Amino acid sequence: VSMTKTSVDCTMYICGDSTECSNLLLQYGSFCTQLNRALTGIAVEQDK
Amino acid sequence: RASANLAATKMSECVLGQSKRVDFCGKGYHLMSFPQSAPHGVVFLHVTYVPAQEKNFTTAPAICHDGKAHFPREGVFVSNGTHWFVTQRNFYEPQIITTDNTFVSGNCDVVIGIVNNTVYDPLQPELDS
Amino acid sequence: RASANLAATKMSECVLGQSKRVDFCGKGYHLMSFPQSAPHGVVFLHVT
Amino acid sequence: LTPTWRVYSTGSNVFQTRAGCLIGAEHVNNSYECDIPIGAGICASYQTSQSIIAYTMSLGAENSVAYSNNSIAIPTNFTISVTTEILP
Amino acid sequence: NTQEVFAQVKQIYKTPPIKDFGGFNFSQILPDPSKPSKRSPIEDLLFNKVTCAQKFNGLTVLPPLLTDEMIAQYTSALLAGTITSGWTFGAGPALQIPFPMQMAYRFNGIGVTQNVLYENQKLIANQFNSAIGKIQDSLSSTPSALGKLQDVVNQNAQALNTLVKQLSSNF
Numbered sequence A: 001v002s003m004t005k006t007s008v009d010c011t012m013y014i015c016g017d018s019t020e021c022s023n024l025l026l027q028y029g030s031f032c033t034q035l036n037r038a039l040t041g042i043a044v045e046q047d048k
Numbered sequence B: 001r002a003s004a005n006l007a008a009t010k011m012s013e014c015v016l017g018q019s020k021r022v023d024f025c026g027k028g029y030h031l032m033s034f035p036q037s038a039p040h041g042v043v044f045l046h047v048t049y050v051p052a053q054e055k056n057f058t059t060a061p062a063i064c065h066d067g068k069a070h071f072p073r074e075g076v077f078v079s080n081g082t083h084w085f086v087t088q089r090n091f092y093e094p095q096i097i098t099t100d101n102t103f104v105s106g107n108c109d110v111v112i113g114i115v116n117n118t119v120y121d122p123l124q125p126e127l128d129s
Numbered sequence C: 001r002a003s004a005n006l007a008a009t010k011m012s013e014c015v016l017g018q019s020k021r022v023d024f025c026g027k028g029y030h031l032m033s034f035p036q037s038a039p040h041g042v043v044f045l046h047v048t
Numbered sequence D: 001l002t003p004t005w006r007v008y009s010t011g012s013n014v015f016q017t018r019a020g021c022l023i024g025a026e027h028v029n030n031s032y033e034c035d036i037p038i039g040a041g042i043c044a045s046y047q048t049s050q051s052i053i054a055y056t057m058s059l060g061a062e063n064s065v066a067y068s069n070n071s072i073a074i075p076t077n078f079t080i081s082v083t084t085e086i087l088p
Numbered sequence E: 001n002t003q004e005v006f007a008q009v010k011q012i013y014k015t016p017p018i019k020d021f022g023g024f025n026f027s028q029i030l031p032d033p034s035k036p037s038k039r040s041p042i043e044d045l046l047f048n049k050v051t052c053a054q055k056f057n058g059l060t061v062l063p064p065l066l067t068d069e070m071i072a073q074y075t076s077a078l079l080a081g082t083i084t085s086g087w088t089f090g091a092g093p094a095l096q097i098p099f100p101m102q103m104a105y106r107f108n109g110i111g112v113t114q115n116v117l118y119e120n121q122k123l124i125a126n127q128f129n130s131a132i133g134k135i136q137d138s139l140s141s142t143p144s145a146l147g148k149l150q151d152v153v154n155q156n157a158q159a160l161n162t163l164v165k166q167l168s169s170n171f
């Protein structure tokens, strides 16, 4: 009926506490936002 | 996988039985279905019943006889212009209105569209003789 | 496409006939259903 | 910029739709079933001498059920028809 | 998808000029000829409820093959077949039947005798009309009624906006 409601922190996954990695990820656009939005949609879908 | 789930459902509900779902297995009142193997698929030969030749008839919701409303047990009241008959819904088979194919459900003041006709009693001729 | 297949099934089984499937077309003993065009969708008025 | 691509045929072939404008197909004011979907209710077909015709597709043959609160239509004959359904 | 959902009917049935359905009132669902597009009042609410448009970065929106008028004509044909014929128009030729008798058919379908309806014809007709009017009012008042279609439109628009905004990143 549903599956595990996992969520992934894209910034915390690609980079640790590093801020240079965070900036280089920032110049890659809004991929992390899309991934987080997709995972949140999956979560709400499991609840539904 | 969605298509295969639909194919399995169609097999179960039309090959293994007769489905009342409308337009699920062929256009019409579904009768049967025959699976046929096909390359990477399946073909169903949906045998369906389709009415062919229509005919206009005058109809009434009930029959007012003996000061009471008579409704068809299974069928509809139809008239060929002068005489009233009860007929099954999907095939024109006129029958004489009797008490076996009709049931009394009150009086004639309350039904809208009721018509005056006689209902044959299959017991009176035997009572006389 | 799954939603559109469900909409086509509901049209066939409730607009074109009376469905005995429970809670398929409205909550209750289904009587009729009326299609209504909507922007990128369809609205069913399930009479039950 | 070569004349062989740009063909207008006096401008009769030019037909302005909502999906754009169709060049090279003659508009016909009657309707058939859709053959090649142009878009926005316009479909094209190859029909007769013979040329591509652009038309508003016909949804179907208009019918009018003779409704009356007093009359019913009951079939007196039937047809056992076999429909073929293909599913991957 | 559109052609599968709406083109179930084979012939465009026409509602009779006179609406004598034994008290049943389909004016809210039948097409309104006064307005330009032949849409019912319910359809008018449904179309009014669901709501950077010139994207020049290679993005274009192709028009649907079935126009809104053609989808409304399909809907009107289905409604006219349902009202005048019943379920008979989906299983072959459309067989005319008075609407009270069609409702008696449906009552037998749910396991209730015709008797129940023929002495409650006025009451059932009034209940049906009131229910349709309440649908009209609830659609008119509640703004979030058409949540699913608006959600689909918003999802597509947000995806397109993200695709456009991705041109601003250096990579």
Ligand SMILES: *[C@@H]1O[C@H](CO)[C@@H](O)[C@H](O)[C@H]1NC(C)=O
Binding pocket: B054, B055, B056, D066
């Ligand atoms: C029933 O009467 C109507 C009246 O216009 C007519 O159009 C229709 O063809 C008739 N049906 C048959 C089967 O003759």
Ligand SMILES: *[C@@H]1O[C@H](CO)[C@@H](O)[C@H](O)[C@H]1NC(C)=O
Binding pocket: B080, B081, B082, B083
């Ligand atoms: C109607 O059917 C009856 C059968 O008893 C027949 O006697 C009568 O002549 C018929 N009338 C018409 C108009 O077909």
Ligand SMILES: *[C@@H]1O[C@H](CO)[C@@H](O)[C@H](O)[C@H]1NC(C)=O
Binding pocket: B112, B113, B114, D069, D070, E020
């Ligand atoms: C059918 O409607 C007409 C007027 O439209 C009316 O005169 C007649 O009494 C009605 N008949 C039934 C059976 O409802």
Ligand SMILES: *[C@@H]1O[C@H](CO)[C@@H](O)[C@H](O)[C@H]1NC(C)=O
Binding pocket: B064, B115, B116
């Ligand atoms: C049916 O007959 C009764 C008396 O037998 C009469 O009062 C009534 O008016 C009749 N109905 C019609 C429609 O003529």
Ligand SMILES: *[C@@H]1O[C@H](CO)[C@@H](O)[C@H](O)[C@H]1NC(C)=O
Binding pocket: D028, D029
């Ligand atoms: C539609 O085309 C036909 C072609 O014969 C023509 O006779 C008719 O006048 C045209 N009507 C309009 C409104 O363009």
Ligand SMILES: *[C@@H]1O[C@H](CO)[C@@H](O)[C@H](O)[C@H]1NC(C)=O
Binding pocket: B053, D076, D077, D078
């Ligand atoms: C029914 O139709 C078949 C052909 O489909 C024909 O042979 C038969 O005579 C018809 N029967 C009646 C009663 O019209």
Ligand SMILES: *[C@@H]1O[C@H](CO)[C@@H](O)[C@H](O)[C@H]1NC(C)=O
Binding pocket: E019, E025, E026, E027, E028
């Ligand atoms: C049906 O509803 C409309 C508006 O909802 C109303 O004006 C009309 O009087 C009602 N009855 C009939 C028979 O149209």
